[PDB]
Each structure stands twice: as structure tokens, then as C-alpha cells.
Amino acid sequence: KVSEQLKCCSGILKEMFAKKHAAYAWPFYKPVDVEALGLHDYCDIIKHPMDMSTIKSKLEAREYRDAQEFGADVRLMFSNCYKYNPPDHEVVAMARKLQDVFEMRFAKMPD
């Protein structure tokens, strides 16, 4: 039931990584490469960076006690995007489309 909810969390991440959503999910797959992109203000503005590969690793390493802790990291990832980027940036629209996928699945987690 709590392992089942963490099993459901694995499924949520599988959906977010799936080819169907790749057109808008791709910016969230891996951590922001500060050096490559010259975003030398990112670590000042975003104190707790998060991405889907980091969440996957934490789920695999049992760093989430329950679905609420997993959900908190997914929402941190989206919140960081909304905080750092101008509200009209394409990546903000992409965040909203991927968050739509996450919120619908997370809401329908059996208990």
C-alpha cells in the first residue's frame, strides 16, 4: 500500500519519461548544465535544484518515505522552473504541460 504508492510513483516517472510527452518533457530529464548554458545566477536563485533523473535515482535509492515526499520533489522541479525563468519563456509552457500529466496521474494514485 505504501510500497504500492511508491510503485505507482515509479509508474508516474515512466509516463513523464515516455515518448508521448518528450516534445515538452525533455528540458526536465537531466540537471541544468550551468557551465554549458552560462547560467551563473541559477545556484543563487534556485537553492534546491531538481530534475527527473535525480528523482528517479532517489526513488531507486529509497530516499522517499511515501508518495507525498516523491510528489514534493516533482513539484520542486516545476516550482524552480516557474521561479527562475521569465513567465513567457517556452520552458514555462513546457513545465505546465508536463505538470498537467503529473498532477492527473498523482491524483488517481490508489489508497
Position among 64, 70, 84, 106 found at the interface with ligand V9Z (CB under 6 A): 84
Q: Does 90 bind ligand V9Z (CB under 6 A)?
A: yes
Which is closer to ligand V9Z, CB of 66 or CB of 90? 90
b/e per residue 48-62 (b: at least 16 CB within 10 A): eebbbebbbeebeee
Which is closer to ligand V9Z, CB of 10 or CB of 53? 53
Q: How many of the other CB atoms lie within 10 Å of CB of 96? A: 12
Q: Does 76 bind ligand V9Z (CB under 6 A)?
A: no
